Amino acid sequence: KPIEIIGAPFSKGCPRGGVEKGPAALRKAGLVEKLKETEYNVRDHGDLAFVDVPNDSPFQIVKNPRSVGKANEQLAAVVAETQKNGTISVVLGGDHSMAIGSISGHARVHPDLAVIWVDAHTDINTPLTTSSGNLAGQPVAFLLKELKGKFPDVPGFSWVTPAISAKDIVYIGLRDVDPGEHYIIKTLGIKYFSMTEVDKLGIGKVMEETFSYLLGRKKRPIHLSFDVDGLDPVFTPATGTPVVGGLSYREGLYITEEIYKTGLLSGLDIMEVNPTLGKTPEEVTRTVNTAVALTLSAFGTKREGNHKPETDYL
């Protein structure tokens, strides 16, 4: 099964800049080369070039609506294209607003996909509930069928068509949810494992329940959207919205190892690595290293070890 790396150096999803440098930082560590050592064939699509929309005025409180909408429409096309050729798409973030295009394009080919969203945040604010207007905090609102018509049509997103229902997504790692967002996830009956549930059950039981919920009735493609801020800031400090009390490095790898074992990974997003936000060079190395480790883990690298078949090592 082939892999296609797609860079999304974009940061208009938030006011802070820097996350657009994420793809470069990840590639610098040798991510592409390391992936080629797994049992997957790897193709690098390179980084997408995003055309900035001039005079991109704010739609009400929403910032950079047209630019974000355009970047995501382009990403959606690329991902849909790769999915059509039966390859696994891997999007290297910039900001999480890019999940709109990544998941939308993925859903065009696999409408029955299930989403596992690892994040400290729900990123489900709507243009009407957001207090900042940052689209990086509203991705899920543009993807859910249940929220269609719950907010005004935003300039640059008419191409969007709600990909999944609130019942096809599972959140893991939540600990910084706005009131409006909490109201939404409760009202919509969305399945989630906040840090409270992770502490209660243990990451082992969390994954067990996550798969039983999403795959119990039918096996289907999995789209893993991973926000590095889902892990505690002591592991992934170089990110824009760090929140204390997060998933450990170990828990993060456990998630990816279990997802690899399902053999259902169809799409993956590695988002929010902002190289300009490390307080030191090492904080960046630390963040990039775990983002890289998570990616390789999603593709077969196991902590117990690995070895190539049909090879008598002795």
227 appears as a binding residue in the annotation: yes
123 appears as a binding residue in the annotation: yes
- C-beta of 95: minimal distance to Mn ion in Å? 8
- C-beta of 208: minimal distance to Mn ion in Å? 24
Listed in sequence order, the residues at least 6 apart from 166 whose beta carbon sits closer than 8 Å to its beta carbon are 144, 145, 146, 188, 189, 190
The residue (of 119 and 257) whose beta carbon lies closer to Mn ion is 119
The residue (of 25 and 174) whose beta carbon lies closer to Mn ion is 174
Footprint of Mn ion (CB under 5 A): 96, 119-121, 123, 227, 229
- C-beta of 164: minimal distance to Mn ion in Å? 16
- C-beta of 2: minimal distance to Mn ion in Å? 27
Rounded Cα distance between 40 and 223, Å, is: 17
Taking residue 1's Cβ as centre, other Cβ atoms within 10 Å add up to 12
From the number of C-beta atoms within 10 Å of its C-beta (0-12, 13-18, 19+), residue 13 rates as buried
The residue (of 87 and 267) whose beta carbon lies closer to Mn ion is 267
125 appears as a binding residue in the annotation: yes
- C-beta of 285: minimal distance to Mn ion in Å? 21
The residue (of 135 and 264) whose beta carbon lies closer to Mn ion is 135
Distance of CA 168 to the CA centre of its chain: 15
122 appears as a binding residue in the annotation: yes
From the number of C-beta atoms within 10 Å of its C-beta (0-12, 13-18, 19+), residue 178 rates as middle
- C-beta of 92: minimal distance to Mn ion in Å? 15
Helix (H, G, I), strand (E, B) or coil at 275: helix
Extended strands (E) in the chain: 3-8, 42-47, 88-93, 114-118, 169-172, 191-193, 222-227, 265-271
The residue (of 193 and 301) whose beta carbon lies closer to Mn ion is 193
- C-beta of 299: minimal distance to Mn ion in Å? 22
Distance of CA 245 to the CA centre of its chain: 20
**Contact predicate 12/98, CB 8 Å:** no
Give the angle subtended at the CA of 298 by the CAs of 166 and 208, to the nearest 5°: 55
Backbone phi, psi, residue 192, to 5° = -150, 150
Alpha carbon distance, N-terminus to C-terminus of the chain:
29
- C-beta of 123: minimal distance to Mn ion in Å? 4
The residue (of 87 and 256) whose beta carbon lies closer to Mn ion is 256
248 appears as a binding residue in the annotation: no
270 appears as a binding residue in the annotation: no
47 appears as a binding residue in the annotation: no
169 appears as a binding residue in the annotation: no
Distance of CA 119 to the CA centre of its chain: 8
119 appears as a binding residue in the annotation: yes
Which residues on neighbouring strands pair with residue 292, listed in sequence order?
none
The residue (of 229 and 232) whose beta carbon lies closer to Mn ion is 229
Buried b (16+ CB within 10 A) or exposed e, 38-74: bebebbbbebbebeebeebeebeebbbbbbbbbbbbb
The residue (of 73 and 229) whose beta carbon lies closer to Mn ion is 229
112 appears as a binding residue in the annotation: no
Binding-site sequence positions for Mn(2+):
96, 119, 121, 123, 227, 229
Binding-site sequence positions for substrate:
121-125, 132-134, 178, 241, 272
Binding-site sequence positions:
96, 119, 121-125, 132-134, 178, 227, 229, 241, 272
